[PDB]
Amino acid sequence: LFGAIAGFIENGWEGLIDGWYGFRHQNAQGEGTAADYKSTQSAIDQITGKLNRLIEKTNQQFELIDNEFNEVEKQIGNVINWTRDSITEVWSYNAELLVAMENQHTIDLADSEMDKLYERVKRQLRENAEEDGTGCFEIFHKCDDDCMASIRNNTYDHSKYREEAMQN
Amino acid sequence: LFGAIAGFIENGWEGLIDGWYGFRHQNAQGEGTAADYKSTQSAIDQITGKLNRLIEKTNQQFELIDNEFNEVEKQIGNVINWTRDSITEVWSYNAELLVAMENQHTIDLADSEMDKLYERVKRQLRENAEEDGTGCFEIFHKCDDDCMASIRNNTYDHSKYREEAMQN
Amino acid sequence: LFGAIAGFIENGWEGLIDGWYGFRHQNAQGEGTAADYKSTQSAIDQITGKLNRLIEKTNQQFELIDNEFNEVEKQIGNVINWTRDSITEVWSYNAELLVAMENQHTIDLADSEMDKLYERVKRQLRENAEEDGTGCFEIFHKCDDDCMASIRNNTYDHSKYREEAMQN
Amino acid sequence: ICLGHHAVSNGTKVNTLTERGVEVVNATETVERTNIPRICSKGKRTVDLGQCGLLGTITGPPQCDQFLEFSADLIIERREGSDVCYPGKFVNEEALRQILRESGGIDKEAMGFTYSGIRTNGATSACRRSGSSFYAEMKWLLSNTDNAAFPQMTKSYKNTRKSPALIVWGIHHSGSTAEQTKLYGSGNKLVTVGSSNYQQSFVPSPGARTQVNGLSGRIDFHWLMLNPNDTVTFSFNGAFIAPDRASFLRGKSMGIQSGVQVDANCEGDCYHSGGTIISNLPFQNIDSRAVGKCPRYVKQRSLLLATGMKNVPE
Amino acid sequence: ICLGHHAVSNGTKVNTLTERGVEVVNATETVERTNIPRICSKGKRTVDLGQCGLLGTITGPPQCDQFLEFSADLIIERREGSDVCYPGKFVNEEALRQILRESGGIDKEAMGFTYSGIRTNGATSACRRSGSSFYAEMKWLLSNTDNAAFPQMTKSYKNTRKSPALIVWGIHHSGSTAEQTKLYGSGNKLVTVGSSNYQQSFVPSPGARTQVNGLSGRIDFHWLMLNPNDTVTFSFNGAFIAPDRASFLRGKSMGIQSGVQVDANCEGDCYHSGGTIISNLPFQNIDSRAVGKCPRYVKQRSLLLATGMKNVPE
Amino acid sequence: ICLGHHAVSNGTKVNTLTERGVEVVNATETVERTNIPRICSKGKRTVDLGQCGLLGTITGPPQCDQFLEFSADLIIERREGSDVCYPGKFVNEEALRQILRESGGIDKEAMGFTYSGIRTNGATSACRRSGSSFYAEMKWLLSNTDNAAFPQMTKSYKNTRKSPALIVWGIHHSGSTAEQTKLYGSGNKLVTVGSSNYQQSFVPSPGARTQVNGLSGRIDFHWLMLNPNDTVTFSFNGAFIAPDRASFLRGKSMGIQSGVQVDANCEGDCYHSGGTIISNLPFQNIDSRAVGKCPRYVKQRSLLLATGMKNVPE
Ligand SMILES: *[C@@H]1O[C@H](CO)[C@@H](O)[C@H](O)[C@H]1NC(C)=O
Ligand SMILES: *[C@@H]1O[C@H](CO)[C@@H](O)[C@H](O)[C@H]1NC(C)=O
Ligand SMILES: *[C@@H]1O[C@H](CO)[C@@H](O)[C@H](O)[C@H]1NC(C)=O
Ligand SMILES: *[C@@H]1O[C@H](CO)[C@@H](O)[C@H](O)[C@H]1NC(C)=O
Ligand SMILES: *[C@@H]1O[C@H](CO)[C@@H](O)[C@H](O)[C@H]1NC(C)=O
């Protein structure tokens, strides 16, 4: 729905076992991969809250209306079976539609979270970098490992390396 | 869902009693706050239409099937109570799911409207300003009060103060 | 929901009979209009899959519980009519809500697809063009017909006409 | 220039698909709880039965003398209402009640039963008018003298209307056998009813019951719906309470059971025993047995629907 | 270069969660309204009962002589069908109809009842074959001569199959008492039926009824389901119409009531009285009492589902 | 610096509104299929009726001598349970079963019926204790000697409690008429029951039935609910099995039918014949007739709910 996951980003990282979303960087020092905690925790909190909303015990008690050992009269029995079958159709429909809708909103929700993380990182880097289109921000200045960590910790200053990267 | 409200914008304006969304500006003349009419009216129209869709009278008439003064026979009475309880469970489920879904789509709808207003203002300001990341557009030219009003009235010209603000 | 269709884009193209979305260009060679195949095919695949999900036969068989030629006894008949009317209310509600929700998600889905196509074209054109705000990318270099086709085929190189278009 | 949204100091918590307690700017209720403690009947032909029972309007005990041919869009049963003056009961009682609630009223028409060599006006002190009387629409068939016998008779009535006719007859179960011989003579009696859709049968059972209204005897009431151009036949030889007039349904109506007063100042289409549910909301938590045009009953006391954005204060 | 979407000059208005009448490019119907005015029975073993009533197939009036051992996947009841030739009625009628509709047909088997000192072949002009006849599967038990008496007999039948046996017997209610004494002798008769799940009771009631088919007498029909290795017992002493053969259910089938002709050219699994609902849509607005494998009935005539984007023309 | 999401090598396919088989990172089941093959009754007062039938607890056959005044939150009926020792049956059987399942147990109280010039202790070999006995809560009313007659009696019982009293009486249908004259004398008997909400009627029917337990006679059992400060009246003259004690409902309970053993180690609130459904899921595919506090039954075997993003591997 939001275009990030599955998605202008090619695929996911099987090596990213630390969280749902994260940053993977290549620089002059080497290559690294860390997990973004706030986005992952947000998606986990929303989806977990959804599951807790669906997981609920029915405190409504129903009593036995048929008899399995001595069958009730045929007419009232056919009315009972007819009603129970109607209710079964209603609840099967409700369950199918519920699961389908919740799955749709779940996938689109995670996609939205990824898009929000990417957009935030774009907010941090104003003219010091140019987005590529596959989920990467091409830097135009020597972003040290402390600079990358400042990007991950939402502390990167835009005016620190601005003019250094504008002319590139 | 869309990231604007609640949200890279810190919080709402309790002083903004003129509408749902709006602009608050600081310049060389002073500080001001006005309400955006089209976005507010759009969200109000959609949510109001939703409420009018839910507020509907059931023109289906149901008759009395029990008897409160002289109780009906126990067997057919237990079938009646069983059916009515099943229907009650179905409608309680439908009401809960309906309200939850409608609330979700409502909140995400307002968030979407805010994001659309912000994106429109970004369309108006092409290179004459740079977004900060908290819902502000940092201007690089002396935007007069008539310039701010031109931004609010969707009449701001991008090429009028372009080169004046590009070199900053 | 996503702001693209209906929408910062003024209206649709009745002459675009080749697909759902597409590009219409004016250059130094002339004017042209082509359809974007991947976005159109994606929206058609999702909506078609939705229709195939709703189009389903009920393999649950129900038997006759009333009698149209010799009316059953009045009490059990009133219980039967009462139950059938309740089920009818439930299914009328389910059908109304289902169609309304599916229509909402359909319209917002197409809007999302348009926004994703526009965003992709923005990814291709990095500083070689500036978006106008009505769905157009104002070029700052002489984009030949092969350049336009390279934009449509997702093969346009950003660094080929970069500096040629940066100074404009 | 900066962009933002509005907020309030005290929002309203609602529930979504993911959370429980999201504070929004504004919200509105979807489950109705407000009840009007009276029967809103503005613009409706209303009949408050009061002390008259709904089934009594077909037989006519003294408390139903003013309801023998009522006409209404709304019928109100009361707890003090009684169907009988002489102790008795109806067979298929609730089905007949449901037939009469949506009948739109009843129209009586004489059936024209003529008898010979028999007593046709039995009375009792339990059905008191000027003195000892009986059901206004019925005829207690006794014997000529203090004993004698009961000649076996066969009466027939053809419904000459285009609407089905409600036929109601009675069978007396005296307090003992000697009373049954005093009223109808010695021997075992029978009452047979015939037509094209009905087939019975019947036979009395004398015996001592409880002293309701001071009497130990009972009276069974039975009924059937006679189709147009069809004939009902009563072949009997004792313990018979014949119908004097048959009933026809006027049209359509609404039937409720209530204990609150009637109010012609307010209008309503959803009723329960405690009053009227005037609401536009799709759900209600007042009464699951509410009848008429009602919002669907739900177990939840409240379900708040968000009508504004999320409230994010500083 | 500019980007945009397509549009049409005449879209289709649909309804969403927020609006009512949003014009989209394309939409499709979800509520079926098209009806096929015939019973589509392609590839199904069909039995059109016609003038034969469904219950008659167990007793066998002249109009059911060709349906005594039918076999079908689909059973069709007609308005002109009749269960009886001699005036009468079934007890627990609709329950037996519902048992027979999904039975897959019936299989008859002789019960082997032998009598002595009695008349076993009573006939009537209302059941006409070559002359005065009777139900093919029943035996009208009368008396040896024009009066005489009725010796009290006790017959028993043990269902020697693995499937329950449908047992149907009759009790004659003559037009008067003198006729009952002419057919079965004087005195009060009785018919008792016993087994491991059933307990009755029965007793006649002679009297004048309406002249259906020119006759004032009636015949009650009663039935029970005899479990395997269980025995049914009839201890009677007059007014008895004994079963000659018992019925067994063949398998499974579908039962409908219709007034339209049968068509083996079209296939269908959803039927009503007016025809067949051939559709893939999830809902239908044709008949709420449709039976089989049907879309769910809804009150809405139409519910348009959007299959395209919103139509925004210039 | 590049941004991305996580993925796995083996995801879980789920279904959405648009597709069928979208592989996501993680998913969980919403339809319960796991069954506990025993009755989880931890912390509940449980009564396993075993060989005693639920209705027998009111009449008291030998197999119900230890259940005459039970008290429970959960009542378990077994297939081997029997309501009777002498062959017979209850009228309105299932309604009484449903009354007793949620009764919370029963409390017996003597009704104080005194008789004169009659036999009050009839016995049979089918109800064996020390020797030939009878129902513990009933009294088989016979005659003084091997024939004689049956004086017509009228007994009355006023429910002096604040709770309705369960009244159960019996009517004997002997194997023939000569047996009925041996037990109660010659003539046609009757049993009439009266109060303020009930009106019957009854009459025996002697005849040869099947030899259940070696006996060809049957016993009808009838019941009613006597309201507080109301009186039940029995006017009879033969073939009567009078109630010795009346029953009162203790409170509330749960009634199930099962064939699996009881387990006090596990707790459960959803039961079926095959065991207990312990689950927090909103749906179940185990048994549509499950009773108690259960998830809603659905036809689908499985419905996987996505708990993670879409799995997009390389
Ligand atoms: C209702 O369905 C059950 C199967 O779950 C079946 O055993 C029973 O016989 C049906 N009821 C009647 C009256 O046939
Ligand atoms: C049905 O429920 C009502 C409570 O609303 C109760 O008063 C009534 O007794 C129940 N029906 C039967 C047959 O117990
Ligand atoms: C149930 O509704 C039908 C109309 O579809 C009507 O013909 C029938 O009489 C109703 N049932 C009773 C018992 O009135
Ligand atoms: C808030 O909702 C209520 C619900 O009826 C409405 O009456 C009121 O006008 C609304 N107020 C605002 C400010 O939206
Ligand atoms: C009923 O009978 C009258 C005359 O006896 C006749 O005019 C009318 O058409 C008949 N209607 C029906 C439905 O049989």
Ligand SMILES: *[C@@H]1O[C@H](CO)[C@@H](O)[C@H](O)[C@H]1NC(C)=O
């Ligand atoms: C429009 O929808 C109908 C619905 O069946 C379909 O048959 C038709 O092919 C669709 N046309 C287009 C252009 O999508």
Ligand SMILES: *[C@@H]1O[C@H](CO)[C@@H](O)[C@H](O)[C@H]1NC(C)=O
């Ligand atoms: C029924 O009886 C036959 C022989 O009498 C026996 O073979 C069969 O197993 C029995 N079946 C049942 C279900 O009792």
Ligand SMILES: *[C@@H]1O[C@H](CO)[C@@H](O)[C@H](O)[C@H]1NC(C)=O
């Ligand atoms: C996956 O879902 C199951 C469902 O219960 C849960 O137990 C498990 O912890 C989840 N694992 C991850 C990695 O989310």
Ligand SMILES: *[C@@H]1O[C@H](CO)[C@@H](O)[C@H](O)[C@H]1NC(C)=O
């Ligand atoms: C029942 O009667 C007793 C005394 O006979 C009296 O105290 C009590 O109030 C009465 N209760 C009712 C409900 O009539």
